[PDB]
Amino acid sequence: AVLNQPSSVSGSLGQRVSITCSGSSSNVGNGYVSWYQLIPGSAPRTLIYGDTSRASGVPDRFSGSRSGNTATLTISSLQAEDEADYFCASAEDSSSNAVFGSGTTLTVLGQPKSPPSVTLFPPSTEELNGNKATLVCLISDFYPGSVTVVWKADGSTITRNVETTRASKQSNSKYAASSYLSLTSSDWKSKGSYSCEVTHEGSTVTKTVKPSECS
Amino acid sequence: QLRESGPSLVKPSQTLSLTCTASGFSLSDKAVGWVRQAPGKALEWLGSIDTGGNAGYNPGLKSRLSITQDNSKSQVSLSVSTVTTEDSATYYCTTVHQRTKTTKSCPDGYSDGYRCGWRRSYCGDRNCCRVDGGNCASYSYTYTYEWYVDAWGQGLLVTVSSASTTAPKVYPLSSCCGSSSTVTLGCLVSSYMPEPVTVTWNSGALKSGVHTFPAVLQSSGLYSLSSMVTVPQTFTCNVAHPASSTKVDKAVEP
């Protein structure tokens, strides 16, 4: 038995949003609901306990309430830092038996779009001595969190041996991603130049390296 | 600050054992709990041990859980027996508030004596009596089970799997010959399994301008991550892969 939350909600900057937490009379109806905020990378943060009490350092923008078997977390004056996964919780039948909600991911709309910063690293001399060459394309500080990566060598698109990560949230609510071109030492020295082309919101940022001068 | 320590990889059907210590205060005065989150799942309660030595567990997992504690060394342990791939999760050590409140009350329209008339003598001491405005009623008892997590540890990622461990190869990253005012360096942590890997710079003395990226997963099952630093001097990245007991301090020179 787990508590029912919406999988995702969204609000605009400066506005307010509500997250519901529906259970039975055994858990939520018991009258002692807690709320927790999970931001990727950081440790989980206790927001609310005892339905309405705020934990230490929790601003009044976070307000908990409950009507019977349904608890609600209300977040006012939404900011980009509020984007996180929110979980409700309650004891059931015992103070040592806690049940968690399904979890709600909060998206704050209206944030300014940000182009990606791109850094393209050549393979190192040590890796080249092992007859391998990895080109590392690091993409950071873009919003919204979706980019398309295209690799090119001497004007031709590279599809084989390309691996690109998902976009992952940064601390500033911006996103990061990386793309790896795994070549051999000979493939690296064969071409005249390699390019990592990152497209974001119709705009493309391109960084290039040339094996003749990366030595 | 709560610190979880234990193995990053454990084989199926083995016993996963973790320990928790606090930095800054004593765990002797607090009730210590364990919470985990499997990837792509919600938070899941495991159990706790309170100041009185009593242990309570998630009923669904009670037969596989054991939470003990040592009060001389100020340490709390967690044991999960016969682990399976479902037990892969990030495990958090917590301090929890646990309390059961009992409330005694007469039912609606009943009192402990006032305005009961003849019913006060007829109902007796043990029961409530009907108020003007059945003849008797017994006391009702409402229980409020208070639970919440006071403090959270940072969490320890534990992967359960029968696959082998591959140590990473750490390579220095730097721009090519041919400039920019702020030099950008990096470190490539190539072809390792399983997660996680930690990266610091100059033994933790360098934090401004550091950007460590999440890992990529190749089809071979091996992971690779990179960490870059922007500096407007010696630079060394400290890579640690606990699953293979590997620790590499790679010097990076432009």
Residue numbers in the entry:
A (entry chain B): 2 to 9, 11 to 217
B (entry chain A): 29 to 161, 169 to 213, 216 to 269, 275 to 296
What sentences appear in the manuscript?
Under these genetic constraints, cattle have developed a unique mechanism to accomplish antibody diversity by forming the broadest distribution of CDRH3 lengths and the most frequent occurrence of cysteine residues in CDRH3 loops. Consistent with the five structures solved previously, the 7 new CDRH3 structures also showed a long “stalk” formed by 2 anti-parallel β-strands supporting a compact, globular “knob”, further establishing the stalk-knob configuration as the general structural peculiarity for the ultralong bovine CDRH3s. Each of the knob structures starts with the conserved sequence motif [CP(D/E/A)G(Y/W)], in which the initial cysteine residue forms the first disulfide bond with another cysteine residue in the knob, and the motif forms a type I β turn. The compact globular folds of the knobs are maintained primarily by several disulfide bonds, a feature that is similar to the core of other small disulfide rich proteins or domains such as voltage-gated sodium channel antagonist mu-conopeptide, CnIIIC.
The four antibodies with 6 cysteines (BOV-1, BOV-2, BOV-3, BOV-4) used three different cysteine pairing patterns; BOV-1 and BOV-2 used, while BOV-3 used and BOV-4 used pairing patterns. In contrast, in the knobs of antibodies BOV-4 and BOV-3, a two-turn α-helix and a long loop extend from the first and the second of the three antiparallel segments.
